[PDB]
Design an enzyme around this catalytic site. Structure first.
Site, PDB file in Angstrom:
ATOM      1  N   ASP A 174    -117.730  11.195 -50.855  1.00 20.70           N
ATOM      2  CA  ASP A 174    -117.915  11.327 -49.420  1.00 20.70           C
ATOM      3  C   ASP A 174    -117.952   9.946 -48.784  1.00 20.70           C
ATOM      4  O   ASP A 174    -118.397   8.972 -49.397  1.00 20.70           O
ATOM      5  CB  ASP A 174    -119.200  12.094 -49.081  1.00 20.70           C
ATOM      6  CG  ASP A 174    -119.156  12.727 -47.702  1.00 20.70           C
ATOM      7  OD1 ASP A 174    -118.390  12.242 -46.844  1.00 20.70           O
ATOM      8  OD2 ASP A 174    -119.888  13.714 -47.476  1.00 20.70           O
ATOM      9  N   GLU A 228    -119.884  29.781 -57.393  1.00 24.74           N
ATOM     10  CA  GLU A 228    -121.026  29.941 -56.504  1.00 24.74           C
ATOM     11  C   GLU A 228    -120.626  29.547 -55.091  1.00 24.74           C
ATOM     12  O   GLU A 228    -120.044  28.478 -54.880  1.00 24.74           O
ATOM     13  CB  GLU A 228    -122.208  29.092 -56.971  1.00 24.74           C
ATOM     14  CG  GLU A 228    -123.140  28.665 -55.851  1.00 24.74           C
ATOM     15  CD  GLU A 228    -124.196  27.685 -56.315  1.00 24.74           C
ATOM     16  OE1 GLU A 228    -124.271  27.423 -57.533  1.00 24.74           O
ATOM     17  OE2 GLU A 228    -124.955  27.178 -55.463  1.00 24.74           O
ATOM     18  N   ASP A 269    -119.145   8.325 -45.020  1.00 26.35           N
ATOM     19  CA  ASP A 269    -119.802   8.565 -43.743  1.00 26.35           C
ATOM     20  C   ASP A 269    -119.443   7.443 -42.779  1.00 26.35           C
ATOM     21  O   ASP A 269    -119.689   6.268 -43.067  1.00 26.35           O
ATOM     22  CB  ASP A 269    -121.317   8.660 -43.909  1.00 26.35           C
ATOM     23  CG  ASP A 269    -122.040   8.736 -42.579  1.00 26.35           C
ATOM     24  OD1 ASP A 269    -122.043   9.824 -41.966  1.00 26.35           O
ATOM     25  OD2 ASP A 269    -122.597   7.708 -42.140  1.00 26.35           O
TER      26      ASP A 269
END
Lengths: 121, 198, 419, 67
Positions: free
Chosen positions: C108, C43, C110
């Site tokens: 992740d 996808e 940040d």
DNA sequence: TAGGGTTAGGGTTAGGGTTA
């Protein structure tokens, strides 16, 4: 949008007379429903010959089974390495009492008309 | 037998200016902090935003009223109206199941919120009874004019990890009722009972 | 030169036409085709102009992918999960039978999540001094993954502005459920608490081996950075917020010591001496015996986000993207040269386009009369550019993965007695 | 059409009512409203695309221009 | 002096590019 579904009698697809990845719609009578592996083995008679087609069912669960009944399957065909030919089901409905000869003559006539119109081009 | 084993929040419309008074009156602790932060900074992140939107949807707020409320509280946040239409009202439309898949969402339960994703810096979602400092919790309770005996009872309940009982005690103290009489399980229950009291 | 948002689209079209490494990208995604149509059931989610969000864009083959990329010219590229059917025909199957099956584990980081601790810059600003933060975070996470769990293949990508992403792409990890990934992220997370909480660590006397390894590998970097560069203990309000992390029994004494002291080094030494004195004089204190350790971890440990890894159908930026604010192209980061990675030296889209113009200028007198297809021309094009080390690192990782596949197939041959 | 909202009250004494004559023709005459004398370069209220809640009304045409 | 009532009738247009 998907590709359309052309009709095919059981014995032709049993002999592998269609290209891999094609979309086809055929008929037959169920013989066994392998519960754990999600596999369906339907059969169709031809005189003294009986032909078998393997149907994956991973896209229509939940699904009731009617032992010894006719069926209509529409989907795509994948030529497996060892299992041979198996059709990926997209829609699988059950029809009973419909006579085969009318259907066979119907596709024969439609093919004849298509070829006749194909004689002008 | 199978049918037997198979198991077997619509208050009328409200205005757009009574929300402040109802918040000062009817918001449970598990969302009063979120409301206060929203009214202070006029900006909130995802975890608080979906929770607040679901709660306001579940207490009788229409699509148009909610759109006006969000656009006002975000204009107070120094945005651009075109950017609002592109992002925020755009998200809000599917937040209520106006378009898209339109799978209408039920508000989060008290148990789910308490056992939800732990908030981090820049986030305010989550009941203070589970994700707040005891001193800050006591200060915020004192800001609500809670009796010292009530403060001690709330602290003891927090120590016992009985957050729902602490919420019950807060409800009883703010509404001046000796006994709530109903077990707390969802913020819609809290708001509907408060509206019944009002 | 300064990146301007009013000139990007033509450069983006040129990049998608010439420099995008389609061959290596397909080679990574295809995985060698051991599983039928594994790549065919992926996808994608583009993002065209005017910030319009689309998703569920499968691709039949590499050539179709190239043609669609050339025609569409999107801004952001993302990767989803593998489903049981082609995503572009998702409405052709009964609801509930179209479920995500596998995806790569990702994390992740940040940079902006350290505002309350950091003081070098403000909000969305960066400095070369603060890069050590994500450097040591990368080292910690990579070492933990390599040793504790033994995951073989890893690929670190710099987002472009403030972040670095992890792309674990081993075999026995793609099939994991959601609970296992949640457990991974929980085990890898130590800084716990919301805004209302001040202290981010509550450690008992016992110390886990993971914490021991982290504190051992964190000492060599904490001293210089913290004491010299940031100078945490510089101002009055600095140690005023510092003392909130320690019991009040010595607050006044430490404040007086800071008043007496002149620089942060002396204050830190006095803090260490006071902590050591209190450890020998522990008297009914609920606090841990590692005040210095816990403050270093609180102001120094990386912070993750469970939401980006808990979901299985979630989306995250693909490598080799183009950030619409700085034009820096997301490139892989070498594992053995992490300490020599300056964020400001990464080539940008405008610089690489001027490099392409100069490359054509050289080709005006060096490469002429070539009857080659676009494949070889684009190959020499991105060879002549500044992306050569990055694509080389990507190719080396792909070669490592290919060698792993060779080893696994040889092991399967040994088990299956087929020689 | 704009409805006025002046001071609200009820007065049972004498009320004097007046009405202007040809408001739009007077406006056109005073400011020289005509197709050949009015341009469409502004950003006032009406004629701009859907970019936000701001659009274009033509300003007052110059009386010194040709009538 | 031969059929009844004989009447012409619906005849447009609507919008993608989305997840908890």
């Amino acid at each position: 949008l998907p590709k359309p579904g052309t009709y095919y009698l059981p014995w032709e697809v049993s002999a592998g007379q269609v290209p891999d990845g094609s979309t086809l719609r055929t008929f037959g009578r169920l013989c066994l429903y392998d519960m754990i592996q999600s596999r369906v083995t339907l059969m169709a008679q031809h005189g003294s010959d009986q032909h078998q087609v393997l149907v994956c069912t991973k896209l229509v669960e939940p699904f009731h089974a009617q032992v010894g009944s006719l069926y209509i399957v529409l989907g795509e065909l994948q030529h497996q390495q060892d299992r041979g030919s198996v059709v990926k089901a997209r829609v699988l409905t059950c029809v009973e009492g419909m006579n085969l000869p009318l259907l066979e003559q119907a596709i024969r006539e439609q093919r004849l008309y298509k070829q006749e119109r194909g004689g002008s081009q | 037998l199978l049918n037997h084993l198979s198991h077997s929040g619509n208050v009328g419309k409200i205005s757009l200016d009574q929300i402040d008074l109802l918040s000062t009156k009817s918001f449970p602790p598990c969302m009063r902090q979120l409301h206060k932060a929203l009214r202070e900074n006029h900006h909130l992140r995802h975890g608080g935003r979906m929770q607040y939107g679901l709660f306001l949807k579940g207490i009788g707020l229409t699509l148009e009223q909610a759109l006006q409320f969000w656009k006002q509280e975000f204009i107070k946040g120094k945005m651009d109206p075109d950017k609002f239409d592109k992002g925020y009202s755009y998200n809000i439309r599917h937040s209520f199941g106006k378009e898209g898949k339109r799978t209408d969402y039920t508000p989060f339960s008290c148990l789910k919120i308490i056992l939800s994703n732990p908030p981090s810096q820049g986030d305010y979602h989550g009941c203070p009874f589970r994700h707040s400092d005891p001193e800050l919790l006591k200060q915020k309770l004192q800001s609500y004019k809670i009796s010292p005996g009530g403060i001690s009872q709330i602290l003891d309940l927090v120590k016992g990890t009985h957050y729902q009982v602490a919420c019950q005690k807060y409800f009883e103290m703010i509404h001046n009722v000796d006994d709530c009489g109903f077990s707390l399980n969802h913020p819609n229950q809290f708001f509907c009972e408060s509206q019944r009291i009002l | 030169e300064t990146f301007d948002p009013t000139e990007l689209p033509e450069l983006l079209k040129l990049y998608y036409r010439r420099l995008f490494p389609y061959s290596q990208y397909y080679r990574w995604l295809n995985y060698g085709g051991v599983i039928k149509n594994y790549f065919q059931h992926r996808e994608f989610s583009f993002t065209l102009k005017d910030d319009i969000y689309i998703r569920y864009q499968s691709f039949n083959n590499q050539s179709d992918l190239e043609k669609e990329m050339q025609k569409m010219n999107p801004y952001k590229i993302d990767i989803g999960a593998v489903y049981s059917h082609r995503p572009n025909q998702h409405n052709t199957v009964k609801l509930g039978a179209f479920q995500a099956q596998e995806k790569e584990l990702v994390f992740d980081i940040d940079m902006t999540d350290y505002d309350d601790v950091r003081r070098c810059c403000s909000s969305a600003d960066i400095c070369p001094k603060c890069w050590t933060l994500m450097t040591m975070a990368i080292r910690i996470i990579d070492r933990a993954l390599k040793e504790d769990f033994g995951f073989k293949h890893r690929l670190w990508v710099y987002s472009g502005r403030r972040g670095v992403h992890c792309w674990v792409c081993d075999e026995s990890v793609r099939k994991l459920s959601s609970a296992v990934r949640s457990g991974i992220v929980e085990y890898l997370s130590l800084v716990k608490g919301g805004q209302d909480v001040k202290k981010k660590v509550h450690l008992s006397e016992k110390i886990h081996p993971f914490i021991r390894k982290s504190i051992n590998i964190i000492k060599k970097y904490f001293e210089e950075y913290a004491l010299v560069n940031q100078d945490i203990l510089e101002n009055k309000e600095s140690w005023d917020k510092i003392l909130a992390l320690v019991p009040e029994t010595i607050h006044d004494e430490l404040q007086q010591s800071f008043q007496k002291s002149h620089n942060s080094l002396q204050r830190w030494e006095h803090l260490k001496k006071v902590a050591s004195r209190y450890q020998n004089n522990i008297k009914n204190d609920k606090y841990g015996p590692w005040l210095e350790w816990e403050i270093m971890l609180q102001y120094c440990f990386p912070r993750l986000d469970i939401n980006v890894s808990k979901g299985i159908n979630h989306l995250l930026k693909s490598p080799f993207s183009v950030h619409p604010k700085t034009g820096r192209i997301s490139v892989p980061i070498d594992l053995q040269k992490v300490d020599q990675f300056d964020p400001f030296t990464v080539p940008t889209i405008s610089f690489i386009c001027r490099e392409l113009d100069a490359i054509s200028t050289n080709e005006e007198e060096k490469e002429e009369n070539e009857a080659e297809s676009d494949v070889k021309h684009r190959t020499r094009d991105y060879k002549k550019t500044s992306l050569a080390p990055y694509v080389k690192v990507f190719e080396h990782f792909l070669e490592n993965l290919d060698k792993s596949r060779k080893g696994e197939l040889l092991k399967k041959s040994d088990l299956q007695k087929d020689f | 059409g704009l409805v006025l909202d002046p001071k609200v009250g009820f007065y049972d004494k004498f009320i004097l009512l007046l009405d202007f004559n040809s408001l739009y023709p007077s406006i056109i005459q005073e400011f020289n409203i005509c197709f050949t004398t009015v341009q469409r370069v502004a950003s006032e209220a009406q004629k701009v695309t859907e970019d936000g809640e701001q659009e274009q009304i033509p300003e007052l045409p110059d009386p010194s221009l040709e009538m």
